[PDB]
């Protein structure tokens, strides 16, 4: 099959650094016309995508030139220069070239995560979803750096988690910053009743996970 | 603007149907390929195949062949593609982006024309997977225990909860806040119903006592909700 | 084109609202005058189609 794949995955500059996003494809791109039937595409959060190059090289009406490249045969770099405000999208590579085509696995371009942690605001919930549900530790963060993020969600204060799951926001803070959310298993009594529940939160420049928690009774 | 960019939005549960539409403009029924997408949350984009929409011929993606329908509704300007057998699995974003036009002198049914690299408005869609705790809004207080609340780091109020109508405009910010926000998001639990965590920032004796609440209208299931989730 | 007073030179930084080394304002003064040269000299023209 065609397998268009992309190389960075994401990019993690600070805005207005040069880059570029690379793919190749297995094999067969030129059609022996030798067009090179590939294209480059974005869409940021919750937009349909749409192209930024077609035919390999051809730019999209009223691209930015520094945010556009080529394709080469089964490789292709498209452009990232200047890294411009609000281009910060998933990005990849497709393939025109015949019916099964793929799209290329939608590398995110990103904001340089600054060293900041997260606030420490997390606890488990008010007596609504605690003592009328469970006093689980319950987790979350405020302005984040993404790159290296961590969080806490587990019983007897262990400022750690496994038994649990998380979510982040868009990098929109000036940090590259991102809030967060998380929840833990624990019994809805037991949670609370340990020594601790934990709540943490940490960034890619974090020493250690932000002290957010419920002492024991106070979840 | 571009009539063939996709439109409509379902939720289904495993082994249903589903269906979809478009419009005879821009990338019209006269104009390109009608090759519909979808792509998971977690995911790129993949082929549901490619039609010609008048007289209605068709190639399907051979992962999805027993699980596909196609329409040349052309009368009705859609291009009305269809699903059977869903999946929880199967629960996706689905899109209508056009082919790049033919290329060539010639005439007939082109295809051969193109691929993964659709080249018009996918304009996009939602197909649910209703498998999930189906179930009406609720906005959990996200506000802190007693050794998190009353201090200048914390943050109040509450965030959609307990229905697979997951999605609501929750965030602490309904009225009794309207800024300050953390964009916690409202993720699934195991029972696809959400677990949200946003919470709006507050000085530090708000933090500890404020009326904060959170506009937690379950979307999917289109009921109002205002609940309050006060710290301390 | 350009029938605006906005910011405009700009576009690897984010443009917020300082006018200055961030993202300048283009349309500066045009003020020609008699005691320049007869090139410098302004002039006041029209042009119709």
């Known amino acids: 099959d065609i397998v268009m794949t992309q190389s960075p995955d994401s990019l993690a500059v600070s805005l207005g650094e040069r880059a570029t996003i690379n793919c190749r494809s297995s094999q067969s791109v030129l059609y022996s016309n030798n067009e090179n039937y590939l294209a480059w595409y974005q869409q940021k959060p919750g937009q349909p995508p749409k192209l930024l190059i077609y035919?390999?090289?051809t730019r999209e009406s009223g691209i930015p030139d520094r945010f556009s490249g080529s394709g080469s045969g089964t490789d292709f770099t498209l452009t990232i220069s200047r890294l411009q405000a609000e281009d910060v999208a998933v990005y990849y590579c497709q393939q025109y070239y015949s019916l099964p085509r793929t799209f290329g696995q939608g590398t995110k371009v990103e904001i340089k995560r600054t060293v900041a942690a997260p606030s420490v605001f997390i606890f488990p919930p008010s007596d609504e979803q605690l003592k009328s549900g469970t006093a689980s530790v319950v987790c979350l963060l405020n302005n984040f750096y993404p790159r290296e993020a961590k969080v806490q969600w587990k019983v007897d204060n262990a400022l750690q988690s496994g038994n649990s799951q998380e979510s982040v926001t868009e990098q929109d803070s000036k940090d590259s910053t991102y809030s967060l959310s998380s929840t833990l298993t624990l019994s809805k009594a037991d949670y609370e009743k340990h020594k601790v529940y934990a709540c943490e939160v940490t960034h890619q420049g974090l020493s250690s996970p932000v002290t957010k928690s419920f002492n024991r009774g106070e979840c | 603007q571009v009539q063939l960019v996709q439109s409509g939005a379902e939720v289904k549960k495993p082994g249903a149907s589903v269906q979809v539409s478009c419009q005879a403009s821009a990338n019209t029924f006269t104009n390109h390929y009608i090759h519909w997408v979808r792509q998971a949350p977690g995911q790129g984009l993949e082929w549901m195949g490619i039609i010609y929409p008048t007289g209605g011929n068709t190639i399907y993606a051979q992962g999805f062949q027993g699980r596909v329908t196609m329409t040349r509704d052309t009368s009705l300007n859609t291009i009305y593609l269809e699903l059977s057998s869903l999946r929880s699995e199967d629960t996706a974003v689905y899109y209508c982006?056009?082919?790049?036009?033919?290329?060539?002198?010639?005439?007939?049914?082109?295809?051969?024309?193109?691929?993964?690299?659709?080249?018009?408005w996918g304009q996009g869609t939602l197909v649910t997977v209703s498998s999930a705790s189906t179930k009406g809004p609720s906005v959990f207080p996200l506000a802190p225990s007693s050794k998190s609340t009353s201090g200048g780091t914390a943050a109040l109020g509450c965030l959609v909860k307990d229905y697979f109508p997951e999605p609501v405009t929750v965030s602490w910010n309904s009225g009794a806040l309207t800024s300050g926000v953390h964009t916690f998001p409202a993720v699934l639990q195991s029972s696809g119903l959400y677990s949200l965590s946003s919470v709006v920032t507050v000085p530090s004796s708000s933090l500890g006592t404020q009326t904060y609440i959170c506009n937690v209208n379950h979307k999917p299931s289109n009921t109002k909700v205002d609940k309050k989730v006060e710290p301390k | 084109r350009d029938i605006s007073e906005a910011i405009y030179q700009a576009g690897s930084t984010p443009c917020n609202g300082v006018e200055g080394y961030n993202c300048y304002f283009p349309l500066q003064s045009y003020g020609f005058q008699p005691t320049n040269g007869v090139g410098y000299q302004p002039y006041r023209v029209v042009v119709l189609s």
């Open positions: 035919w390999a090289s």
């Open positions: 982006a056009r082919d790049v036009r033919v290329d060539d002198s010639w005439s007939g049914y082109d295809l051969l024309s193109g691929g993964t690299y659709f080249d018009y």
